[PDB]
C-alpha cells in the first residue's frame, strides 16, 4: 500500500526502506516485471541474488523500529521501476510496500 | 467422493476434487477439479457500510483461497453506528444492518 | 543457520506404464548445519527401514554454508488405485515445531480438466 | 420509472411491515446527514387484515430528480422495542434501485495454482 | 509447483534406474551442447530392496523459475554401457503432461443455480 | 447435504412429520417444492403463515428440548402427497434441512 | 536490455555494437518488426542473410573482448528501425540487447 517513491542518482549507493513483519520469516525485495502477471525474487533471506544484482546489493534485518534496510550499489536504467517488498513463501501473494526508483543524469 | 480443498464462505468458492475410474483398466484415469463461485451484485464494497457504491469489480486469487469481503455469513451479525435526533438530542445508536442472525 | 526447506514428488506419468513398481522421492535441502534423517510412515505406522534410502547430507551447487540429501522409496504399482497418501516427514534442530510431515496422493498433483462453474444472482449477499 | 420519465421530482418510499405492538420511530437522513422533520410525512399504524393482531406504518420522502440523479445515497432507520438492536436500517440509491444494465468486471487467475 | 509459486529455483531431476553393472555416466545439455557440469550434481550408484543385481542414480539442476518458465527443455542423458547406440535420454517441460480442457459453465440467470 | 428421511401413511386418516430444529432461528417452514418452476412456496411457517389450501389440517409445535419440531396433519386427500421439506432463515430456497417424501397406499 | 541506439549517415556504412556470449553459438542481429510481434531474422552464424539486406551487412565474431561486430554497408529510410541481438535457436526469446538506428539526410 504504502509507495517511498525513493530516488537516487546514477552510480553511488541507494537504501530501500521496507517494514520488516513478525511471524514471516522469508523476507524478499521482488521486482515488478508487469510482463505476464509474474514478479521475480531479487533477494530473499533464503539466500537468492538475481544474476543481474550479484555482488551489488544486501539485506540486513534488525528488529529496532521493525525495519529491514535493502542497500543497492550502483545504478542502472534498468534500475528505475517497481520493487514490491513482502514477506511469506509465496512471492506474488505478499508485496506488502510498494516502491519506485529511477535515474537522475 | 468428492474431497473439498476449499470451502470460503466470505467469497463463496467450493473447490474441490474427484478421480473417475476408467473403462476397467488403471489407466488414464482422469482427475477432476471443480470450482463454483456465486457472486452478489447487490452487496455493497464495504459490506459493513452501507454507503460505499456498489460492488463492480470481483478478483478472485485462487491460490489465496486454498481483507476486503464480498458475502455476508449466516452465522454471524454485522451492526454500525447511526445519529437519532430524537428530541433534538443528536445520538450515535448502534444498528443491527444484518438483522434475524443476531438473535 | 536456516529452515531446511522441504518438498515431496509423485512417480512419473511414463513411470506408470510398464506394471512393475513405482517410485516416491521426498527431497530435504538446506538444514544448516547438516542434521536430518527421514522416516516413511504411512497412516502413522512408521515403514520398514529397508524401503526408503536415505543416502547422505551434500553441499548445494552453491554453498555458503547450506546442504541438501534426497531420500526415495520403492512401492507397488497395483496399489496406488488406493493411494494410502505415503507420508514423508523430517526432523532438525532449526525447526519451531521440529517436525514438517509432508504427504502426497493420487488425488492431488496437476489437475487435467478445469470444471469452473460461476453463477449470478442478486440474492447471493448472505451466502448461506 | 414512469415518475422519472417526467423528469420533475422523485418520491422514495419505507414500508414498515408486521410489528406488535404499534411504537416504531423512523427517520431519514441523506449521505450521513440527517434531514428536517419537515422534508417527509410518516403514517399511524393501522390494521393488518391478512395478520390479526399485526400493524404497519408508510413514511415517503420527496426530492428533486437532480438529487436522485447524482448517486447521493437516502436510508429509512426505524426504532422498535422488537429490534434486537432497537435499530435497524436499509439503504437504496440510483444504482440500486431496480437499475437498467449489469455492468460486470468478473476476473480470476492462477486457476491452477497449488490448492491442498 | 509448490516451489514455482515461490519463484526461487526449479530443481528438475532425472531418476536413472535400474543399470547393472554400477557404471553411468549422466549429463544435462541444452540449446545443443552440453551445461556446464558444475551447474548440476549427481549421485553415486546404490542398491535396491528387491530383485537381484540393479543399481539407481539421481541427478539434480537448478534453474530461475522464470528461465524454466519462458521455456528451455534441458534434455537428461544416460551413458550406460548396455544400451542400443550406449547412449539414451530422456525430454520433459512445461507442457509435457496431457493437455487439459476447460468445461467453463457461466449461468447469468439468477433463478437457476443455488 | 443432509439426510433424506422419507415417511409413508398406509392409507388416509392421519400423518406426522418432524425434522431437526437448529438454534438461533425464528423461522420454520415445511414448502412442498412441488412446482415445476421448482421454487419451494411455503405451505406451514412460523413467523405467521399457511397454505390457502392447506387450512385446519396443520399445526406445528417445536421442542428446544429435544432440538426437533413437530408437525400434525389430520386426514389425507391425492392433493397433498409428493415430496416436503424442512428448513429456517429467511429465504425459503437455498435454507432447507431436510428433504422427506409423502405417500399413502390407499 | 542497455541501447547502443548508434546512428549514422545516408549511405557509408555503420557498425552494431552486441555482446558475444559463451555457450551460445547461434548469434543473430534480428529485426524487431513488432507487426504481429514477431522477428524476423536479419542475420545469423548458421548463415542466413535476409534477402532485402543480401551484400549488405556482415558478421564477425572474435572472443577478444567477448564482442561481436556487425556491419551495415550502403543505407536506406528502411535501414531506421529496432534491430535486437541474441543468441538461441528461438529468435523471439533472446534479443539480449535492444539498440535503434535511424538516417541523417
Ligand atoms: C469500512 O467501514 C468500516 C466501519 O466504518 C471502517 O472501519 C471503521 O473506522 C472507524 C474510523 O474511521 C472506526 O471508528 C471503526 O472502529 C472502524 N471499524 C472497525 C470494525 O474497526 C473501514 O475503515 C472502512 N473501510 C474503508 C476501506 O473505508
Ligand atoms: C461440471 O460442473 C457441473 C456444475 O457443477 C456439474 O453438474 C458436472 O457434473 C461437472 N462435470 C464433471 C465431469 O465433473
Ligand atoms: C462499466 O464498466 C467499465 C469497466 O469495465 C467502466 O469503464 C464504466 O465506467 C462502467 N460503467 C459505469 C456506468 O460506471
Ligand atoms: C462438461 O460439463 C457438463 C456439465 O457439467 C458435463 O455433463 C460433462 O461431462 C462435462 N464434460 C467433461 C469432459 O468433463
Redesign the interface.
Known amino acids: 500500500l504504502p509507495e517511498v517513491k525513493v530516488e537516487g542518482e546514477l552510480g553511488g549507493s541507494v537504501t530501500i526502506k521496507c517494514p520488516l513483519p513478525e511471524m514471516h ?1 522469508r523476507i524478499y525485495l ?1 521486482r515488478e ?1 508487469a510482463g505476464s ?5 531479487v533477494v ?5 541474488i ?1 544474476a543481474e544484482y550479484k555482488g551489488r546489493v544486501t539485506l540486513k534485518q534488525y528488529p529496532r523500529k521493525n525495519l529491514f534496510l535493502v542497500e543497492v550499489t550502483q545504478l542502472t ?2 534500475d528505475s521501476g517497481v520493487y514490491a517488498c513482502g514477506a511469506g ?5 505478499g508485496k506488502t510496500q510498494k516502491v519506485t526508483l529511477n535515474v537522475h543524469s | 467422493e468428492r474431497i473439498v480443498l476449499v470451502d470460503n464462505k466470505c467469497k463463496c468458492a467450493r473447490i474441490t476434487s474427484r478421480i473417475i475410474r476408467s473403462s476397467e483398466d488403471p489407466n488414464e484415469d482422469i482427475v477432476e477439479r471443480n470450482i463454483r463461485i456465486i457472486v452478489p451484485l447487490n452487496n455493497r464494497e464495504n459490506i459493513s457500510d452501507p454507503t460505499s457504491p456498489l460492488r463492480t469489480r470481483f478478483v478472485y486469487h485462487l491460490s489465496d483461497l486454498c481483507e476486503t469481503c464480498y458475502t455476508y455469513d449466516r452465522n454471524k451479525c454485522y451492526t454500525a453506528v447511526v445519529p437519532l435526533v430524537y428530541g433534538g438530542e443528536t445520538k450515535m445508536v448502534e444498528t443491527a444492518l444484518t438483522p434475524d442472525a443476531c438473535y | 543457520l536456516h529452515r531446511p526447506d522441504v518438498y515431496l514428488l509423485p512417480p512419473a506419468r511414463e513411470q506408470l506404464n510398464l506394471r512393475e513398481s513405482a517410485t516416491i522421492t521426498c527431497l530435504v535441502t538446506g538444514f544448516s548445519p547438516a542434521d536430518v534423517f527421514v522416516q516413511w510412515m504411512q497412516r502413522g505406522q512408521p515403514l520398514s527401514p529397508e524401503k526408503y534410502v536415505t543416502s547422505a547430507p551434500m553441499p548445494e551447487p552453491q554453498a555458503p554454508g547450506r546442504y541438501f540429501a534426497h531420500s526415495i522409496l520403492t512401492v507397488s504399482e497395483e496399489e496406488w488405485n488406493t493411494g494410502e497418501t505415503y507420508t514423508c516427514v523430517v526432523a532438525h534442530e532449526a525447526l519451531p515445531n521440529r517436525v514438517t510431515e509432508r504427504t502426497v496422493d493420487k488425488s492431488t498433483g496437476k489437475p487435467t480438466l478445469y470444471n469452473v462453474s460461476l453463477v449470478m444472482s442478486d440474492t447471493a449477499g448472505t451466502c448461506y
Chains 1, 7 share one sequence.
Open positions: 520469516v521482488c516485471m502477471g509474474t514478479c521475480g525474487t530473499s533471506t533464503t539466500n537468492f538475481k536504467e534498468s513463501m509465496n512471492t506474488d501473494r
